[PDB]
Structure formats: C-alpha cells, structure tokens
Amino acid sequence: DELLEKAKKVREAWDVLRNATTREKNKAIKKIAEKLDERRKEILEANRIDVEKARERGVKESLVDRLALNDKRIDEMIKACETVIGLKDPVGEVIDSWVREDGLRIARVRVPIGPIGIIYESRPNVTVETTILALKSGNTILLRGGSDALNSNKAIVSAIREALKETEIPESSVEFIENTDRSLVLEMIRLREYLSLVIPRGGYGLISFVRDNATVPVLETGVGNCHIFVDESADLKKAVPVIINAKTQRPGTCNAAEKLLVHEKIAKEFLPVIVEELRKHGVEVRGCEKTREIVPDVVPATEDDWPTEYLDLIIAIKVVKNVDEAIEHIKKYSTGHSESILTENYSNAKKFVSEIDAAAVYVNASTRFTDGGQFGFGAEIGISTQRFHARGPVGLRELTTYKFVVLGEYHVRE
Fold first, then answer.
1. Distance of CA 341 to the CA centre of its chain
2. Can you say where in the cell this protein is located?
3. Does residue 208 share a domain with residue 257?
C-alpha cells in the first residue's frame, strides 16, 4: 500500500521538520535549487518522455505546453527557491501575548499545520513550488501529480530528496505517489491520522471532487466568476484600461474579469466605447437586453451566462440601475473570488467594499491583482475562496496554525 506507507513516512518526518531552524530549512531549499540545476539533464530527459507521450495521444499543444520543461523553466523553479529562502519564516511568530492581572504570561505562537497533501495534474513546476512553501513553513508534503507528468515529477522529486539527504531534514519530508490511479485520491483525502491539510490544484472537476469527499481539512482554490461594476461617476477614460487589463491580460486564469456591470446613466455613452475596445482585443461580448438596445450586435446573454466563468476572451455585460442593483447582482452570481467597483463616489465605494464578500474587493483597480506576488506574499500555492482558515493567496503564514504558550510561577486557577 504505497499511499499508506508514504503517508506514514511524511507524518513521521514532520516530527523532525516542524522543529527545524529556518537556517536548516533554508539550507535544504538552497540544496533543492542546486540539485535541480545539477539534474537538468535527467529532468529534461524524463520530461522528453512525458511530452512525446502526450503528442502521440494528440493532446493539443497548448496543454502539452503546460507539461513541457526546458532550461528556462528549471530556472524559474530555481528562482522560486531563492524567493522562498528570502521570505520570513512564520513559524514561532507571536501573534499576540500579554500578562494577566495575576502575572500569568499568555502568548499565541504560530506553528506548522502538519503534513500537506497536494493533488495536482500536469504542471511539473507545481512539484517544486508547493514543496518549498511546505518545507519553509515546517510542513512535510505528500505529492500526487498527474499521470501525464509522472516521469518529470519522479525526476524532480528524486533531485529534491538528494538535496534533503545532505541536511538534517529527513528525505521522507517529501514523498511522491507514483500510482496515478484516481481511486487513490479518494483514499488520500480521508487520511486524517497522517495529513493535516489537502490542497487540490488543476481542473475544477478535481477540486470539486476533493472538496466534496475530503475528511482531511481542505483549502479550496475556487472558481473566479469576477465582476467589475462601472458606476455613474467613474472616470470612463481610466476605466477602459482597467477593464481591458482585467479581461485580456490573462483570460485563462481565474482572476480574469468575466462580467461587466454598467450604471444605466452612463450606459448610452460608455457601452459603445467599451464594447469597441473589448472587440479590438478579440473579446466576444454578450449582453443583456438593455445592453443590446444600445449596442445592437452584441450576442444575446442567456440565464446561463451570469454564473459562467468563461476563462476565455468572452464577457457578459449587464446594465444595472445603480450600485444597489450591482450589489444584488454580484451577491447572486459571484463565486467569492474577486469583485471590483469603478467609481468616484465615496459612499458607493464604501458600501460596495463593505457589502461585497469575496476574497478580494477592489475600488478603482483591476481584478488581476488577486495573486500572492501582487499582494506582497512572495509566493503562493493558489487563491483560496473559502470562508475558513485562509482566504486569498495561500502563502507561508496560511500554512501555519498556532497554539497558546503560557508561562507561570506555579499558578492555579481560582
């Protein structure tokens, strides 16, 4: 039973890693960078097999590209190591601490969450990215990637463990499931005696499955049906690039704007402009009946459009009466990722920011910013969209919990 033996191994190794100094964990991560550099040949030969196998099966090249490695991409993995080494270790940070009226000292102190299961598909960089975030934060890791990237991931994991072997961090801090079979995923997300957290990455099918069936705590990096509302007093000239940025900079990633809500008092003036500009960038524009009264060639929006995240150069536009209707629309259709208001009105900005509950809520800013690098985290595993433990970018601090440390002088409870 590969899964059980490897889950036992990461749990045992955690006993050592959780109390390693940052110096030792940084040394391990530096060695990871060094072994990746040294094992380029092996990693690329393994990856050549994965790539030729995907091409044989007629996987389309945009997906092969997700799987493909070369020197530059190994360099990105190396740079990720260097970024993580430079980040502050959250382990041991005091959240707060005080002295009670009787002299008892109380503190809340951050500690590692425990072994993390990562269930992911085909991007081999994910192997390094998650590992180094886990190790830095004092967590072991159990990796299960896609059958497409299996050779690549073996070679990378082999390089990682070679590095670990030259430190005091046990090699079994990083274990990797070679059995691709997906029945294993169902077992893995129920292993509460070994894993403290699982984080699915990849398609929504896989994320839904893991989140629906897990008994181990999950951080769900959910769907991003993201709205931008253009209010009456928005600076319409500056609004245009924000909307374009949000939609077209990276349409395939989930903080892309999918929906545009537009105040009725500027709709006649603004819709012809924004629709023209969206079309210059290859965007297919769908619209409500009021949108279509104004710009008669837009594709008629259907009821299914409003909840749908396109992840493509497609957008649906609705005219709303005011910020109150904008809020009602977003509450009905948001998936709690990113939401933005473009306005010059203090009260409307304030109401929007207070009433819209999503991982990130913006005034006069692109939804593209919802990202750990942009938010000053350095590196992330992904964007959590749940209202539990962590929301937004999941970086080093989000991979910790805490405990109370209490220092007395033989204190007894009254």
1. 23
2. Cytoplasm
3. no
